[PDB]
Structures are given as C-alpha cells and as structure tokens.
Amino acid sequence: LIAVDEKLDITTLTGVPEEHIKTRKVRIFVPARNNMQSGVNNTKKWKMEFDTRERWENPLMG
Amino acid sequence: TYKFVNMREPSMDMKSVTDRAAQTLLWTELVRGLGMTLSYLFREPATINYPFEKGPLSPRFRGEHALRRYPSGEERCIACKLCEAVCPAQAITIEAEPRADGSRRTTRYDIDMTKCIYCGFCQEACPVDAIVEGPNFEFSTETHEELLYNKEKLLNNGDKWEAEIAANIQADYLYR
C-alpha cells in the first residue's frame, strides 16, 4: 500500500489525441425540462457534453 | 435420456475377425462409397436454368425499396419520420415542409442502400403503407453512387413495381 498525492491523471492512458484533450470545453449541467411536456423525469441526472463543432453539407446528397 | 454413439466393442470370434480382415484387404466400404457416388451421378441434377428460370419466392420477400401512391395519384408518405426513428442502420434521411397546398409532404427522402440491412422495419412502422420493400432483387450497379437512392428514384421504383407490390400486399396484408 504505497502513498501518493497525485490528482489521478489518466490523460496519457485514455488514448485521446492531445488536440481533443486540451482544446475541449465540456458543459456539466442538469438538462432543462422540455417546455412542450410537463414531465420532470429527464431533469434528475447530471449530463456532461462537449462543445459544438463545425458541421457542413455533403457535396453529394447534401 | 441419453444414448451412446461410439461405445460398442466388436466381437472377437473367428467369423467376425475374418470379416474385418476381408474388409481391410478388400475395400468394401470404399466400394460402398463409390456406389453411392455412382447412384448420385445417375440421379437428376437440381440446377435451375438461370436467368431463364427463377428460384421460388414469397410475397413477404424484401428487396428494393419503393414509395407508393394512392389510387388518386397522391403519394402516401406524410413525412412522419417513423422511418428514420425505427431504421436500425440509420439509412433513411427525411426532410419535410408544408406543400404549396398546405399538405404535410416530404421534400427530401433518401435511402442509402449501401447502409440498409434490408430488415423490413420501415414498412412495419409506416401508418400509411408508403415505404415498401419491393420484390426486385436484381438492382446491382457499377458504381457506389447509384445505390444512394433519393425521393425521385424511390417514386420511380414505386411506379415501376406498383402492380406487383400491390398484389403482394393484397396477398399478405392479413398476416400483419
């Protein structure tokens, strides 16, 4: 049982590219209740999602 | 219950020993195999003369996709996107807007036939029986692009195969 005070960094082990590791801002939020419905069962767990990037149109089939 | 398949000790009497020795020296089982193969040679082959003869099919067969119309000529699809919701492979792309007369009709309806798995879920989920799997199965193409059907291609397929598709649906609509 060794002792260490590190901050549990698994960046080098996840395998994600450094670009997507260092240039990504995620949003930790509880999703808002959909106003079209009165149910509140989708607003109970926290969600982590990444920032939106570019989305263009395919030259073929659009 | 159970049974044994290879637990049977052969008899060691002189008659059986001589029979087994004759089987070893005189290739009895090999001659038997030759006789069976000769019988199969003299039997009639089971080959059909394609393409002049076609293998049997069923009204439930799933092949090339098609979009149908009403007897009045109006297309059956109402742009409900249950296609896109239920498609396992996400091979259907639908975009809709109100028509000039105010109808709820599609403006884009694309099926990627190279992504579709021909599972038949789209025609089960249609509330109006618009999208169907036609009986055609000989629509091979020489390029990848030609398998990216759009609304015009699907409507042309429906118009082309409407008679056979209607007959199949009439024959097999009571089981659904």
């Binding site: 570019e54 263009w56 030259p59 | 990848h144 692009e145």
Partner: protein, 337 residues
C-alpha cells in the same frame, strides 16, 4: 466565390476544399499523383479520359463519393474539351508523350491540344489554368519534343494570359521513366553512355514535390500568370547518377562509351516497335542534354515546398529491381552543385 465553393471541414477526405479541377492526362504519373493530392484535400476532380475505362480504376479510391467524375473526351475535339471544362474553375494540363504515334505527334500533343484546352478554358470562364512544361524548353532545342513544348508554352501563354506554366526538370518516382529507364538498361549488355556521361549534369525533382507544388500553385493567389521552375536540391553528373542507381539496385555496372550517331541509330531501332518503345532518339537526346539553370524563375522554395534529395527516395524506386533486398549500404553520389 460561389456559395457551394466555400471551403469547409478540416481539409480531409470528406471535406470541401472549394476547388473544382479538370485534370487532363490524369491517367499518367504526374496526373495520378495530382488527382491523389486533390482527393486527399477533398476537391472535385473531373478526369477526361480517352483510354479504356479499366485503366482508370486506380483513380477511384483517391476521392470520396462523387468527388471523382470520369468523362470520355477526344484530344481533337473542342466540343468534348468544353464539355469537360465547362463547370471547373481550375484546369490542369499534363498531356504528354515520350514518343510519337501514327495519329499524334509532338506538335499534336504539345502544341495543338494544349492550345485548344487553353482557348476553350478562357471562353468557359475557368479561373485558373496550370500548364505543365519542361525545364529545358527551347525553340532551337535539338529535340522536337522540347521544341514543341516551348512552342506550346508560348501559344498557351498567348491564349490564356493568366496562366501558371510549371517546368519540372526531370521527375523520378515509382512509375517514372527516368530511374526505371536507367536501371533497366542492363539488358543491352553494358550500359551505353555518350562520352561516358561525364559532361551531362542533371537536377532531378521528386514526383511528390512536383505534385505538392502544383497543389500550392492553385491555392496561392500570387501565381496567377507566372512561370515556375521545379528543380532538385542537388545536381549530379550523368555517370555518377547512373553509378549510384546501379549501386542502389545492386546490379553489375559496366558503362561503355557509344558514339552519338550509333546511339541515335540504336534509339531509331527501338522506335519501330508498334507498342511502347524502350527508348527513342528524342529520349536519348534529352538524356544526354544538360539541364538549364534559370535563377530568375521562382521555384519550390518560393511556393513553400522543400525539395527532397534523391538519396532519401532512391531506395523506394530501385528496391523492385534488386534480384537477391540485397541489404548493403550505398555511398551517396557526389554532386556538382
């Protein structure tokens, strides 16, 4: 720019580069590499072809779905030329031939066809025209090949003022006829050289470097109507270059001097082949002709491309010709530079 010509994506296979390029003579060495680079960057490539469609199969994986379009064209048909350049904002001309056939000559393939392509492109609203020429292009050159290339360069410049004339010296690569031609002369006994090749200096350039320069010329706005000269970083004597080629190929190297008239007669002998000839008189003249030095014209360093020395990329081409692969070190050839 058109709304559909605005670049998008991260410059990958599925992205839009905004470049619609009609590439003439794409079923060749440099055309193949250029089409590959355009497909990598995500452009819309139009490939006019005259040969069998089976010979265009290798160009299909280079582009995404619908990016590569194959259209049948005729060299002596301005109607087909217009049909294939009608919707492109870039036109690349790489049509060429080391020899002459019974229907096409050097003038036909280097003066007539390029002039028609340039003329139709100007009338079709094509924004950019890249035309490939030769570094040793001179009106009074000994070879009809270079004479016709110079005449065609002048005619194309006259027809399309805003043109980019690219003049590679001599391109070496996997499918080249420079290193493959030099390494395959072992069949004719010893290797024949004019004056043993000690008076000819060559500066070869990499196929990848040439293709990258062509791609950069399209994107760079300062090369609208210019003339470039793509040359390698080092200049080698012909004898030393052939010796290095044979050392890398691990083949027995025995050079012998051959008189100029005898070598021309030998080249004439090979021209009688109805198929592709091993060598021609014009090819012998070009091989034994020196490489012109044009410091005035800009080059790969001006376009942002660092030329690759022949020592690094020689092993790729010549590994095929090894017979035993032979896993022995080869000393670099000394350069005149």
């Amino acid at each position: 720019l058109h709304h559909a010509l605005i670049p998008h994506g991260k410059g990958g296979r599925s992205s839009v580069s905004g470049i619609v390029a009609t590439v003439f003579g794409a079923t060749g060495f440099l055309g193949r590499y250029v089409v590959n680079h355009l497909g990598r960057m995500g452009s819309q490539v139009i490939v006019p072809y005259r040969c069998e469609p089976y010979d265009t199969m290798h160009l299909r994986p280079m582009g995404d779905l619908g990016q590569i379009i194959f259209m049948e064209w005729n060299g002596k048909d301005k109607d087909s030329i217009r049909k294939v350049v009608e919707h492109s904002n870039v036109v690349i001309n790489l049509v060429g031939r080391e020899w002459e056939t019974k229907n096409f000559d050097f003038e036909d393939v280097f003066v007539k066809i390029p002039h028609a392509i340039a003329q139709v492109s100007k009338e079709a609203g094509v924004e950019k025209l890249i035309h490939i020429s030769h570094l040793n292009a001179d009106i009074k050159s000994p070879s009809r090949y270079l004479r016709s290339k110079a005449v065609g360069e002048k005619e194309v410049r006259a027809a399309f003022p805003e043109a980019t004339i690219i003049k590679p010296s001599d391109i070496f690569g996997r499918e080249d006829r420079f290193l493959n031609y030099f390494a395959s002369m072992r069949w004719f006994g010893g290797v024949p050289l004019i004056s043993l090749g000690k008076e000819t200096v060559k500066q070869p350039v990499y196929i990848v470097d040439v293709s990258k320069g062509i791609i950069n010329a399209i994107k760079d706005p300062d090369a609208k109507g210019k003339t470039f000269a793509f040359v390698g970083p080092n200049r080698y004597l012909l004898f030393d270059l052939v010796q290095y080629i044979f050392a890398v190929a691990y083949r027995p190297f025995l050079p012998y001097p051959l008189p100029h008239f005898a070598y021309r007669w030998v080249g004439r002998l090979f021209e009688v082949s109805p198929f592709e000839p091993w060598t021609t008189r014009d090819k012998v003249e070009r091989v034994h002709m020196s490489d012109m030095t044009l410091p005035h014209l800009p080059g790969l360093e001006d376009l942002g491309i660092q030329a690759t020395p022949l020592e690094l990329k020689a092993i790729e081409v010549l590994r095929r010709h090894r017979t035993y692969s032979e896993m022995e070190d080869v000393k670099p050839a000394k350069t005149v530079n």
